Amino acid sequence: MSKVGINGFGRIGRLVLRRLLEVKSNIDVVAINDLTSPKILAYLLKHDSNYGPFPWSVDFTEDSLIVDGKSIAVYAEKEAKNIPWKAKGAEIIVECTGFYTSAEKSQAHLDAGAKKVLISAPAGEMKTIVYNVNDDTLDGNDTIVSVASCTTNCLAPMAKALHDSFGIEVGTMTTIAAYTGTQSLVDGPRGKDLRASRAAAENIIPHTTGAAKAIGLVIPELSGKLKGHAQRVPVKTGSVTELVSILGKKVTAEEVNNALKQATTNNESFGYTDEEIVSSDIIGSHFGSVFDATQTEITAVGDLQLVKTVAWYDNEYGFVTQLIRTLEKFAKL
Amino acid sequence: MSKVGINGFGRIGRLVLRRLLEVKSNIDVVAINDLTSPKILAYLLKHDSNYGPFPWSVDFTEDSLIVDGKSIAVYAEKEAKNIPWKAKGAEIIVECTGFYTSAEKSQAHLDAGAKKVLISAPAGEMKTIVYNVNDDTLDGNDTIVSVASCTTNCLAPMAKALHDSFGIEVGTMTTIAAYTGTQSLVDGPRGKDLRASRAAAENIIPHTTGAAKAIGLVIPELSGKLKGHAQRVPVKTGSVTELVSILGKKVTAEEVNNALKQATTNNESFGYTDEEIVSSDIIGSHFGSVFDATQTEITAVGDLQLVKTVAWYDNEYGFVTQLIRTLEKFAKL
Amino acid sequence: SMSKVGINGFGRIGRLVLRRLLEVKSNIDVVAINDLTSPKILAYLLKHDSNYGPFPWSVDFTEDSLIVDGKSIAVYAEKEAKNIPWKAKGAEIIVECTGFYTSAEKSQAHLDAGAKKVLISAPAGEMKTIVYNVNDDTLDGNDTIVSVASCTTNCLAPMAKALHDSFGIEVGTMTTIAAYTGTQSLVDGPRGKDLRASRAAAENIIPHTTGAAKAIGLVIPELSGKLKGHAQRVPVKTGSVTELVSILGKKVTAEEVNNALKQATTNNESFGYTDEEIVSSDIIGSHFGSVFDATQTEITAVGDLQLVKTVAWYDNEYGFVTQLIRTLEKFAKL
Amino acid sequence: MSKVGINGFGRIGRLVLRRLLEVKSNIDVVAINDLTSPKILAYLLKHDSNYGPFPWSVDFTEDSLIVDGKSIAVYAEKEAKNIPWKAKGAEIIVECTGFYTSAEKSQAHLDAGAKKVLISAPAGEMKTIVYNVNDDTLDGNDTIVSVASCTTNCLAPMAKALHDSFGIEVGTMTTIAAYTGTQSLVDGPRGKDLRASRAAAENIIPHTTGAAKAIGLVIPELSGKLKGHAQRVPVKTGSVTELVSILGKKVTAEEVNNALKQATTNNESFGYTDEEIVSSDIIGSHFGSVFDATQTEITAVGDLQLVKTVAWYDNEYGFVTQLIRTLEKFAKL
Ligand SMILES: NC(=O)c1ccc[n+]([C@@H]2O[C@H](COP(=O)([O-])OP(=O)(O)OC[C@H]3O[C@@H](n4cnc5c(N)ncnc54)[C@H](O)[C@@H]3O)[C@@H](O)[C@H]2O)c1
Ligand SMILES: NC(=O)c1ccc[n+]([C@@H]2O[C@H](COP(=O)([O-])OP(=O)(O)OC[C@H]3O[C@@H](n4cnc5c(N)ncnc54)[C@H](O)[C@@H]3O)[C@@H](O)[C@H]2O)c1
Ligand SMILES: NC(=O)c1ccc[n+]([C@@H]2O[C@H](COP(=O)([O-])OP(=O)(O)OC[C@H]3O[C@@H](n4cnc5c(N)ncnc54)[C@H](O)[C@@H]3O)[C@@H](O)[C@H]2O)c1
Ligand SMILES: NC(=O)c1ccc[n+]([C@@H]2O[C@H](COP(=O)([O-])OP(=O)(O)OC[C@H]3O[C@@H](n4cnc5c(N)ncnc54)[C@H](O)[C@@H]3O)[C@@H](O)[C@H]2O)c1
Ligand SMILES: O=C(OP(=O)(O)O)[C@@H](O)COP(=O)(O)O
Ligand SMILES: O=C[C@H](O)COP(=O)(O)O
Ligand SMILES: O=C[C@H](O)COP(=O)(O)O
Ligand SMILES: O=C[C@H](O)COP(=O)(O)O
Ligand SMILES: [Cl-]
Ligand SMILES: [Cl-]
Ligand SMILES: [Cl-]
Ligand SMILES: [Cl-]
Ligand SMILES: [Cl-]
């Protein structure tokens, strides 16, 4: 099964298609479901405020997109159980709407004729993959799987390296993160998340994330040992994650940095920098996470030591490269 | 005096209450309708990203707001015909949702028991008031009235002065305008306006407006003589309108400026500046429009002459002061 | 008491110094301003403020002065402090807000220029350094040059002080997510030798050094050498927030931390408390130097290993300025 | 000639090198003058907030950059007199500091041993080239020439087409333009220009431009016929120019757009779109100007007619592609 459907052709959904074409994947996107017309989806695919013009041709008909010459059916079923995935034989659904982030909810795609679902977000207690951290846990019998959040994909490679090298006894994370579509343009009701109701490009906005709390799904030894949250700020994409840890060994910054560099060597998912980059430098990254050695900080008083480690991440395209790596392996199991 | 209900407690709707309290109006707001809980409306009223903390105490119960110790009923009826306006005696509805911009749609407020409706937007061919341009056309028989857009309230006072002093033969308008809630935070579907789908805080976005086309409802002699559009840009509020005119007589810049100054003298609605201000200086303006003599430009070749005149406006609060001026007169009639 | 003040550096901080003094109807009179420009330009900037809106009093100017609320203020343009003619109008205390005299050696030039005392709006080495309502009782009559530290210090210190007093801080690290300022760059281009400072401030998250934690012992001596930290500069015009992750000297709950901080902010004009779901624009114009936010408190514990994260907002412009003015009013009366 | 020096390695200066390399030009940049260290110039060349990572390897020594394996000398002479252009053999100086915008000032580069100078800004009464409008006026005896402003390179192509097809009797433009390094990050003195003292990313800021006033240097028949200004707004690059004209014939929108279409066909400098683009879609443009037929507007009242035509431009990269076109030709004469 190499035929894929995308549910939710938004920021993540459209970049999923862009990245599959970019790596010349064998995967075949045969169908897209969203809430709108092919005309609007085509316009959005062609013109991207964060990544510029689509590198391939885009046209549309009344019920399809034509992308690089190839027809993709377009459906508009707001309930996944009604998506006609069998018409073009979509077997794996990349679930990118945010409305089906649980096993019970994404089961609808299987009731609708698909064989497997890969959810682009945390989805409770199910197989949750950060590629090149725990993708070896994926199994031929898995049918509904999560890639967690962009934040998880940033935190986990760094926490895995520190865990393997030094032990993490306890830690807390703050990500300073680009705003996303769950926020608001102008002050106004946004469900029941009050902070989410506030103008996102005009505020620093505290925001919850399960990235640290649910880390045990990805690194079971760290289960319950991490907590964290986000500060959403006015950049359009490109984010950074700080982890403050008590480690299991006394370290120097050079030692921490060296251990991280070894973990990023020959690692297509986890990059390393000792350059003085800022967030816009991460936009377009092909890594899920880029550890920044320039921000490593060891605070020591007598016997006590706090270790701050920092990694950048393009919460859109970078995370998407991780989603695709996982999808390619998923599709072959 | 009259009791008011507010439909749509959004950017404009909340500022309606703020301005009414600020001027210590005789009008009592007795009921609000929206789509959310009193808790969420209280949070949004108390904390404003553009105008700061609410100047009065704010609390809520399960079915009301308490503002400066006064109770305001809160309803959540998506359909205006279902709002119980009679329960608290709301006589005049300030219609601020965007979903009732016609005589026929806003009739549902009269069906539901109100006497009059003031619509905070263009609403087709009905009486359409820019205070201190044509508010004298209101009379005791009017029951559904429009104050047009923020753009009309910025265009009309300037166009009326030029018309009165020099005549306008033909003109075109461009407003460089703050983004608003009809736009998108991230690239995504926004109805059928393609350009409205693009990230508003990250782009210059061309945007249609009816202010020029429908100016004849406010200034009858200018019917058919003006066109225009908007460029929406990344400022949160505060806007400016340029009008390029062929006038009915030859003029100098000083002459235009003196004529506008006379038109703004003792004019609570229409301000004048010859200071080198920028958009943030108009935020919180108590004028619907402020003419800027520093940007007047006369381009002339032979007997041909283009006149560019420029006025600032706080599309949120400044417009609201005009809406309240009109509401205050509407209620006395 | 000393009542006549001069401002050196009529910038973001210096202009708000005047605004706040008029706001609180201080007996302190600003009689002179020094900067590098014309009265016309200084009057333009005082009248029109992108962050706080129109000046609340009238503003006019002459060729050598500003006229503010009807009161004349002399304007000088001496790039070297030693040349400022402070004695013409009798300016006694200089509020030093240029960023170019951030040491005792540098700022004593104002004394050479005829002033009696200097209050520096920034860290200024190992001199007497005051965070009001943390350690202002250490000011005495012999202090002649004083620092109020940074906006970050005025945010970090009240929170750390309450933690220190209640539970002990054995070690900690701070990250402030902070509004950009004029030390950064509008477009990518050289900005001295800080590489990251060269990058477009309104288009990036930009890591940025601060001394607030490293030098906290000037304000809370028992924490000397126990804290580190840095900043992430982000695209908001003003309004900032500081997170502190601490190992405390006691096992705690979140309610227990929040209650201690609440007690420390009670009857405290410098240090506020909130349990509302606010965002940065809600702190713009704060009359506090720091506002502890109980909704962000987080206790992470594994056995006897405990990390405590406490968070406080601050308006790095106006809120800091209110602390500067508090210290100035006390300074002038010693 | 084939050996270039760059004075002012800023936004334009760095992009000049980027573009020369992108088009595999035979011109080689042999030296750079600025005010800083090779390390900082290397950092800035490698990491670009608007265009992302440099596509070629960058490194430095104490006195040079190494770009794609080639060494480039780096000087830091505040005064062009002192730049040893001689040493490395720098024949043509691309003058991008803003501080030598006259034939008299750029004389210094010739005194220091350069043979020609191309100034990246208006520089008074000298040959001023918009490529594919008037680059044929260049001859082998030219030593110091200007490529005008980004605004001129946007206005001139559109004006030229209209003038050729219809005649422009008089007109005025407004560009809604990305903020640049001449503006302020926070409110504070910026020389004598009051509006330039204001926070550029938080404001709409009126701003003077000479593009229209000086158009006669590029289109001599339009001398003294145009005026205009700018509104600088909070986007980092990517701008748009509106021109309101009285034409010499009556026209329809379709007729205007087909005239512009024809003038842009096989026109490598001047592009055409009828797609609903927004400013970020122009970032990275390889045109000096892109005419947008979706924004054409004809306001007609009897014999009078105002024609609004609109063209997009990447004021950084797009303008640079025009500068390089002119340079390549300038170098061969
Ligand atoms: N933006 C990020 O940085 C990021 C990173 C990683 C993961 N994610 C997660 O991926 C998912 C999508 O994120 P996004 O930023 O692309 O959101 P988005 O709002 O840009 O896209 C959501 C798409 O789903 C469509 N949609 C909504 N409900 C639908 C429904 N019932 N049926 C079909 N289509 C529907 C919408 O029209 C839209 O196109 C979320 O779960 C998000 O948490 C986001
Ligand atoms: N610059 C401005 O924002 C501005 C200026 C002048 C006029 N207007 C016009 O005023 C009106 C509101 O504009 P806004 O910026 O305040 O928009 P908004 O989106 O901020 O507020 C709209 C409010 O109405 C609520 N709402 C939506 N549908 C509803 C319904 N069926 N019933 C009850 N409540 C509903 C929404 O929850 C929201 O609180 C529009 O007509 C707008 O064109 C806006
Ligand atoms: N902006 C903040 O958030 C903040 C908060 C607390 C403390 N501070 C500190 O306050 C001081 C001022 O900061 P700011 O943001 O107001 O900077 P600013 O750049 O806005 O103001 C500096 C002012 O001083 C002028 N100036 C520069 N050199 C001068 C000289 N030799 N003589 C006279 N005037 C000169 C400048 O023209 C300008 O008006 C700095 O030390 C800063 O670290 C800033
Ligand atoms: N930014 C635009 O959109 C744009 C477009 C077209 C033309 N221009 C013009 O091109 C020129 C450069 O504009 P920019 O945006 O790149 O400015 P910039 O501020 O980004 O770059 C100017 C460079 O020149 C350096 N410099 C300043 N003075 C110098 C000196 N005496 N000697 C050597 N180096 C010096 C600076 O360090 C800086 O690196 C200006 O004349 C501008 O009007 C700008
Ligand atoms: O990022 C998130 O991930 P989780 O909250 O952990 O599910 C969300 O908080 C909201 O933003 P997003 O869904 O676009 O990523
Ligand atoms: O829903 C959001 C508002 O309607 C925005 O106002 P607007 O109509 O002026 O764009
Ligand atoms: O605080 C650190 C740096 O000095 C930059 O910020 P500033 O404007 O407060 O001086
Ligand atoms: O140095 C820069 C020039 O003086 C101004 O040109 P600019 O405003 O278009 O960038
Ligand atoms: Cl958590
Ligand atoms: Cl129109
Ligand atoms: Cl000195
Ligand atoms: Cl430190
Ligand atoms: Cl002009």
Residue numbers in the entry:
A (entry chain P), B (entry chain Q), D (entry chain R): 1 to 333
C (entry chain O): 0 to 333
Paper text:
The structure of ternary complexes H177A.NAD.BPG and C150S.NAD.NPG provides further information on the driving force behind the phosphorylation step and the mechanism of the nucleophilic attack of inorganic phosphate on the carbonyl group of the thioacyl intermediate to generate BPG. In addition, the O subunit of C150S.NAD.BPG and the P subunit of H177A.NAD.BPG contain an unexpectedly large electron-dense cluster near the active site and NAD+, which was attributed to the product BPG. BPG in C150S.NAD.BPG and H177A.NAD.BPG holds refined occupancy factors of 0.85 and 0.8, respectively. Upon the superimposition of the ternary complexes C150S.NAD.BPG and H177A.NAD.BPG with their corresponding binary complexes, the RMSD values are 0.104 (1197 atoms) and 0.168 Å (1235 atoms), respectively. These results indicate that the overall structures of H177A.NAD.BPG and C150S.NAD.BPG are like those of its binary complex, except for the presence of the product. BPG is observed in a released state in H177A.NAD.BPG. The oxygen atom of O5P of C3 phosphate forms hydrogen bonds with NH1 of Arg232 and with Oγ of Thr182 and Thr180. O6P and O7P form hydrogens with 2′-OH of NAD+ ribose and Oγ of Thr182 and water, respectively. The oxygen atom O3P of the C1 phosphate is stabilized by three hydrogen bonds interacting with the amide nitrogen of Gly210 and with H2O 551 and H2O 689.
